[PDB]
Design a protein around this ligand. Sequence first.
Ligand code: NA
Ligand code: NA
Lengths: 399, 396
Amino acid sequence: MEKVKVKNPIVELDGDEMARVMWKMIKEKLILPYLDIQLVYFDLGIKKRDETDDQITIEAAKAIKKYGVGVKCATITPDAERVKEYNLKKAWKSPNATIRAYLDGTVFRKPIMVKNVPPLVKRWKKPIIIGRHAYGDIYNAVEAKVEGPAEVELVVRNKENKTLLVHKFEGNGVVMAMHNLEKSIRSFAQSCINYAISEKVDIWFATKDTISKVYHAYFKDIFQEEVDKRKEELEKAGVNYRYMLIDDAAAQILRSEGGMLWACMNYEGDIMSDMIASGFGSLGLMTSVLVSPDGVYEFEAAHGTVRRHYYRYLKGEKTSTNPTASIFAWTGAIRKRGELDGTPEVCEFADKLEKAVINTIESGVITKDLQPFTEPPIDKYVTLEEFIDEVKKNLEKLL
Amino acid sequence: VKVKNPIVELDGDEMARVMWKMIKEKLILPYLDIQLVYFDLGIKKRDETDDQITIEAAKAIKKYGVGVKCATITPDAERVKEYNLKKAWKSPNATIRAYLDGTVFRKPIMVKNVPPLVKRWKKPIIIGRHAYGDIYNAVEAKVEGPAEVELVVRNKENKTLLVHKFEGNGVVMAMHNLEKSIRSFAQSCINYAISEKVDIWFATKDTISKVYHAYFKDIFQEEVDKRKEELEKAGVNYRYMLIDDAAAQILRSEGGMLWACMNYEGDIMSDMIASGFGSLGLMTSVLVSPDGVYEFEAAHGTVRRHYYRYLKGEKTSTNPTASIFAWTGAIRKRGELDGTPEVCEFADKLEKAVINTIESGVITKDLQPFTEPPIDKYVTLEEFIDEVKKNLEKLL
Ligand code: NA
Ligand code: NA
């Protein structure tokens, strides 16, 4: 059997630790034997980024924008500990933050659902996608302890100068000031609109604009503006926009059948991506995809580098690390590249490999992370390589 | 059945007030020799007194230690027109809350044939909300064009922080919170947890907010340190967490803890977690103070839409369960404070009578969508209290 021809390149970003180990196996067992595919390769392993003073990350980001579809392996974000461990020059910045900013993108988290690994919320029959506005607010704020009897003002200073009284302290406390940006919020809404049209799902956005009548209102107003500018496009895709109050939204989410994109401001999105992921089960089944306003797509698994399985691997051991999310990053990228190039055999292949993973799990062949979520409970689990071998087997059955 | 000391009783509004009277005269008073220190916080009585009976009610509670409050109307423009008021008076709940320096705790009532939407949740999750400050007392502004925005602290120490240099347009916000308020919050949480014998989970994003969220983290720990002996005695563990970790863990847990939340978080999570349990009709609510005062209330409102039907001569299926458990909560707390273990035993029996009513298939309408297996029919308000009465008589 001939390999399926992929017309245009996919940009591939290699990563770190156990993620990197899985990545190599997926390519060799599940991807390269079946596809004649051009991969524009950037090694984003910590030592390559260290060697090039992180310039390789920017080059990677440029390539993703250029070709339009990327697929990325998880990477170490160094803290002081990693600097010591890998003898780094510097605590380089998160490759993800660098790439996301370069691409003006928003990250969308969506669970893979499998019949025999049901979510922890009974109602949830369809994936809930979390899209987080990852700019500003608390994450770029400035703060101060206020001990004394004091007055605190926010000063706006140039065309129209103004002073606002934050608080007249009599006793002690703390103060915080934050900002966000029109352009940032517009890009976020635009990326949500793109993702929802692509996925054919409704958009829920929510704030507490009844309290925050300028700041939260701003996001509400911008989001609605962007939806209005895309009224027909949204309606053609069957996408409904639902603006809610944030506490109402959270209550309704938990109550729903799932199936929507929940667009969240920065802090809420940080919390809810984790909380909703938890409601679905294992992080091993969480996919992630960056989408930008200009239609650039970058697929990744939602989890990290899985360093503690990696430390076990370094001692010679097989692990039971779940490759499922990494596989679906590959198949997501492949499908997208296929849809763009107009090459339906490419989409078909991505469908078949995805189907092979799901068939593997539903047939009772799981890695260790899925075990406490199985129904009926599954007693046995296999190593990462056994799992990939079973996926390969089930792929062959469909080809 | 005696009850050594009085309880402060706060009458309310609309359908809530209607259930209130019904419950006293059918389920409480026929069984207990109590001095209720009565305050009518009905909107008409509040308007006449210029909101003073509200303040009067709160000063009585602080004195007598235990209060029980009916849902009241918080007036807006529509309500001013409806009841022909003087002003849109301030929320009684918010008025009392501040005076008593209390924090509110929400706890679902669990019932076997009305299961939560979250499978793992086997024990109630209490949400305690720090209902002062942050975005609720924030100051905000739209920013156009090139501009520099700054945070300026003035007086004992003088400080200017660049918030942002704007090239395009955007928005800014500044907020505050207070040492005292956060301490009172932590104190109330510790009181509640010791009373309920549950663990305390507190969480922030102090890995990002290294001064502001850290302040809450440090103060909460300080207050736990101050009371570690009694906490250890009651079997209460304190578990500080990162906020996003906590939320993931809560959904993953079997319930059973108090989750203390900062203002915004608590606004969201109270509703979210209530939703995970089922019907708002099975939600109890208690204000605890740092000094140990308690005020028991239903979580629900006045149910105006049921009240209007009532005035039109229709029968409703309004749920009194939350109301009754506000009464029993008050009765039990007052029983244990004097040392009268018969008052407590009645509080138990009435709660257990309600639970037996529901579990036998006798429900109000609001429960129907949640019951498992589903109940084909529902009973009215009057009929539900009558069955609760039957089932209480069976236990006495
Ligand atoms: Na998070
Ligand atoms: Na709320």
